[PDB]
């Protein structure tokens, strides 16, 4: 419960769609149920609900800027062998010379 | 050759067998080698720890979306004090009637065994809490 | 690698599902392609012949010595003459109540399919005998 | 023995080269000797010695 499972630093400006459409998560536990909190600094930006492997994403469109770090915070204890979570973000193709 | 219809068949099959534990029972852990089948009696296996199946321990079976089976949730057993230290190789389950129900397998969490051990061996007297368990009818 | 007790467990489930046909039932034979699962309705396949399961369709169930599975003898529906030609590829089972039970594919006499035929090529007006067929379930 | 060390959720349809070419492993343990197995769903799909 309340474990900062994973984080990442944003290097280039990025845009995420509404409700994180296109993101996906998977885990072996066919019954494990819980809710994951997706924070940005100290501001709530998204959350996901789990019900026997049923993942539901809920959030609105938002931006990401260099200098920002995305933070993932759990809610309650979980039991499983592995949990897979992945988000989809849109980045421009500006070359770096 | 068979694709059991979930609501018509798989749920019925799940309820029929898992409902035998409505009165509860106990779970027995024994050293190896694992008996070939439930009809093979205990001859040299060493007990390591015992557990109590909550009454009821199963049922009702419920559908699992996006999966090729139907599951029935299982109850959570109490943390029972293990006996003498030993490396488990198999285990046996008993209903409250004291009747053999099936044979199981032992493996670390990474393995598929319903015996979801966090560690290979269990010491003596160290109460171990069972993570969880359940039974799912294949389809 | 769960193994069931043939007496207390295996035959209970075997009876739990096979007895559903004690009121009788029916079977369907269709060409390809096979729909994904029973809950998917027939769309365009062509029916070739239908059989009716005399009541009781099954029961009682016994043990199979020298095997890891249990079985249950089933009734023998009478011969049926196909109304249409073609090649059977897929079959669906229909109880007298009208509810689906499950589905299975077809196969040759050397196949393990839910339906075994010397010839998978059929012509309207030529029936065949359902000599025997039985249920099985690994323990 | 029999322990999972990594997993990942595939986002967009992807192809895998034959023999897992391009893939590479490195470690400090010059005496390490073992075998790895690649599993998707239920059945193994690749192995590395």
Main beta-sheet strand count, sense and barrel state of chain A = 5 strands, antiparallel
Strand content of chain A: over 45%
How are helices and strands ordered from N to C of chain B? EHEEEEEEEEE
Helicity range of chain A:
under 10%
Largest sheet of chain B: 4 strands, antiparallel
Q: Spatial order of the strands in the main sheet of chain A?
A: 1-8-4-5-6
Please indicate the percent range of residues of chain B in DSSP E strands (runs of 2 or more).
25-35%
Rg over C-alpha atoms of chain B, rounded to the nearest angstrom: 16 Å
Helical coverage of chain B, percent range: under 10%
Number of strands of chain B: 10
Protein name (chains B, C): Structural protein
Organism (chains B, C): Agrobacterium phage 7-7-1
Subcellular location (chain D): Virion
Protein name (chain D): Putative tail fiber
Report a brief summary of the structure.
Chains B, C: This is Structural protein. The structure is cut from a larger assembly and holds 2 copies of chain A and 2 copies of chain B (139 residues). Chain A has 97 residues and is mainly β.
Features:
part of a larger assembly; 4 chains; A: 97 residues; mainly beta; five-stranded antiparallel β-sheet; two-stranded antiparallel sheet; 0% helix; B: 139 residues; four-stranded antiparallel β-sheet; three-stranded antiparallel β-sheet; 9% helix; Putative tail fiber (chain D); Structural protein (chains B, C); virus; Flagella phage
